[PDB]
């Protein structure tokens, strides 16, 4: 029951990982600002190597939709 426990598997679809991250962060005790910062930092930090590369190359200005689509070619079902 901690956001720190959320790390993308090497074969895990990025969409599945973000889903787990989001649901866990909803339940986490934190201010909205801290949750925003957690998302801006941990989500990319804890992504698998290839998704992490894509996300960083996209940059912090990327939207959720773009982000999901940009990573959908990595990993398995």
């Amino acid at each position: 029951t901690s956001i720190l426990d959320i790390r993308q598997g090497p074969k895990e679809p990025f969409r599945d990982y973000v889903d787990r991250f989001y649901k866990t962060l909803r339940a986490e005790q934190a201010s909205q600002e801290v949750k925003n910062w957690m998302t801006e930092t941990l989500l990319v930090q804890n992504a698998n190597p290839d998704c992490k590369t894509i996300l960083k190359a996209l940059g912090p200005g990327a939207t959720s939709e773009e982000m999901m689509t940009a990573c959908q070619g990595v990993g398995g079902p």
């Binding site: 973000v18 989001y22 962060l25 925003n36 998302t39 939207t63 959720s64």
Partner: peptide, 12 residues
Amino acid sequence: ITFEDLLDYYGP
């Protein structure tokens, strides 16, 4: 993205 972006994407 932020948590608010995720809220917007998924809804409740």
